[PDB]
Amino acid sequence: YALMVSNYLNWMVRNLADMEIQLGAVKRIHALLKTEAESYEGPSLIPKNWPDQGKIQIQNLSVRYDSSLKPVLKHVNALISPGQKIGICGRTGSGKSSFSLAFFRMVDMFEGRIIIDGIDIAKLPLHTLRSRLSIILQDPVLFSGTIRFNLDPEKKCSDSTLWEALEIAQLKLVVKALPGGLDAIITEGGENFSQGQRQLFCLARAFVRKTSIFIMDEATASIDMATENILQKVVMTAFADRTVVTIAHRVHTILSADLVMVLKRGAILEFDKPETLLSQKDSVFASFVR
């Protein structure tokens, strides 16, 4: 036993050090587990189908990214009639992307009321709120796989549906020119598609989602103006019976809309008539910019 333990002593010390290192590993896992405070979703309005009427209204809205930090929005008040195209404009840091993120309850320090057809989050969990709208971002992401997986991960669409969705999104010709049309292998980003094509694929997600409300945060970011004008005309003729709220740094797109609101340093202001909204400002914020 002495000759045995004279070796198993060092062996045992080494094994104990190894266990200590691995247990510190487990400890960092357990420390990672319990952060991310619940922020979880938690049935009277669910049983009734989500209304097609796109009438919405935000009263006295503010927003703060981090708790106890500077406010991003301040005294936000706006209303939107059913089935009408809504335009928003503003400089950098004005709060347009913040407006969109707060429309989805992605910013956890908002104050005010967001009513959608006499319906708000007072009786609805977050899932039915994630299924009620559609959103296109300025930051186009595309995960690897096939074109069917990027266009519809639920795999609940017919091939003619996606072909029509691509022919409407001005993307059919560049899809037909690839091996395995709807089954070409996509890599994460890469050069299989330029920035504009990724934007178009996000637009195609929006097309196939078939919701009642649309959010469009700079679909003009990386698309040529010549193709962008006709693309916006086709996307307006396609989504006629649903509300669309756009934020584009292109002047003409803002011009084509009826109800346009300009975000200010912290606040907004709405205007409707194209001939009245351009001379009421004394031709400062919407005319000379055009």
Partner: peptide, 12 residues
Amino acid sequence: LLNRIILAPMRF
């Protein structure tokens, strides 16, 4: 681990 990460807010 995976369902702890999925139920996290965007700020985290």
